[PDB]
Amino acid sequence: PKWWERKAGPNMIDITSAEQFLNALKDAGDRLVIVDFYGTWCGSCRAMFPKLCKTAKEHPNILFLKVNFDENKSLCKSLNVKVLPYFHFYRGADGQVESFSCSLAKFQKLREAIERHNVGS
């Protein structure tokens, strides 16, 4: 049971290809989408994961995409991801609306981004 699968709820999906990633954004409709770029051996990513999972339970209608950088290097490079943890947000016809790094200590940055782009904001 890999650390990134523990207590991961139904709105948290593993992405394993560029095709799957693009299909996920398309099928999201007008939902807010949070893309979590993480590394297998990223201590910060691992430390912040339980809080991310709680946030996913707190927001059942937000779609969370987990993208393992180490297993999706070309995809992550095409998305200009250079450091981990990293987050993109996407929302409907607006496409990408956030791009930022985070950690457990500054987790409120992620919530602030939700405040800016959640359905009804």
Catalytic residue among 45, 53, 76, 102: 45
Q: What is the resolution of this structure in A?
A: 1.7
Instruction: Please give the tally of structural domains in the chain.
Output: 1
Domain containing residue 1 = 1-121
Determine how many CB atoms are found less than 10 A away from the CB of residue 46.
Answer: 17
Whether 76 is a known active-site residue: answer no
Give the list of residues 6+ apart from residue 115 with CB closer than 8 angstroms, or none.
121
Here the CATH number for the domain that contains residue 70 is 3.40.30.10
Clarify whether 42 is annotated catalytic. yes
User: Torsion-angle region of residue 101: left (phi > 0), alpha (psi -120 to 50) or beta?
Assistant: beta
Alpha carbon separation from 70 to 20, 26, 56, 65 (Å, rounded): 17, 24, 23, 15
- Phi and psi of 30, rounded to 5°? -100, 10
Q: Decide: 37 and 78 in contact? Cβ < 8 Å.
A: no
